[PDB]
Design a protein around this ligand. Structure first.
Ligand SMILES: NC(=O)c1ccc[n+]([C@@H]2O[C@H](COP(=O)([O-])OP(=O)(O)OC[C@H]3O[C@@H](n4cnc5c(N)ncnc54)[C@H](OP(=O)(O)O)[C@@H]3O)[C@@H](O)[C@H]2O)c1
Ligand SMILES: Nc1nc(=O)c2nc(CNc3ccc(C(=O)N[C@@H](CCC(=O)O)C(=O)O)cc3)cnc2[nH]1
Length: 159
């Protein structure tokens, strides 16, 4: 199956010109936890933002051009990306906006972190219809000494 994972501020804002204005180590731990040992598909901008291969995962980067880093796998279409993942239980799509919109119709599961941050950005998570998804897990966390905002983890499965 194909899954998306993302951190969403209010209005599904997912990305800005620069790094998001929050310190959320617990969310990064959730991200690692749910992606380790699985192929991860990302767009070139997200690859550049991360700045290195994510360890312990097969990193697959979408770009229309040949790759510029031989440590990771580079593909030029959604179907090539999927094929490059091989026979695995779960493919993780980790963004960014362009990539999320392409994969959402193919996806069976969403891993979302809802962040109580009323911020502005240039990249959003695609619209999804709550009636087409069953929420199977939810977990709230307040802001604390190590996390700048309150965050709520959710897992949704497509009906
Ligand atoms: N809040 C979160 O959880 C989260 C997660 C990931 C990223 N982000 C944020 O998202 C932003 C990036 O999103 P974005 O939409 O700008 O970029 P993106 O989706 O990361 O990358 C876009 C690039 O991917 C390539 N691409 C996408 N689809 C393709 C296809 N079908 N065939 C070939 N190439 C394809 C293209 O590369 P070429 O131009 O080389 O052809 C394209 O320019 C950043 O601000 C980042 O911080 C947020
Ligand atoms: N929930 C969620 N939160 C995010 O911050 C997030 N970010 C991306 C894209 N950006 C990033 C940026 C950095 C790292 C990263 O460095 N991750 C490390 C753990 C963090 C750490 O080392 O402190 C990792 O191994 O996964 C991952 C994804 C995709 N989906 C997301 N989904």
């Amino acid at each position: 199956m194909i899954s998306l994972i993302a951190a969403l501020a209010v209005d599904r804002v997912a990305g800005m010109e620069n790094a998001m204005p929050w310190n959320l180590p617990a969310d990064l731990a959730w991200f690692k936890r749910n992606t380790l040992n699985k192929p991860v598909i990302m767009g070139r901008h997200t690859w550049e933002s991360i700045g290195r291969p994510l360890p312990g995962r097969k990193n697959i980067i979408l770009s229309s051009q040949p790759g510029t880093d031989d440590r990771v796998t580079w593909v030029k279409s959604v179907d090539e990306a999927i094929a490059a993942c091989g026979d695995v239980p779960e493919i993780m799509v980790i963004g960014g906006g362009r990539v999320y919109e392409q994969f959402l119709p193919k996806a069976q599961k969403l891993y979302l972190t809802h962040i109580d941050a009323e911020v502005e950005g240039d990249t959003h998570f695609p619209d999804y219809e709550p009636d087409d998804w069953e929420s199977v897990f939810s977990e709230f966390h307040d802001a604390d000494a190590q996390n700048s905002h309150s965050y709520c983890f959710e897992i949704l499965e497509r009906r």
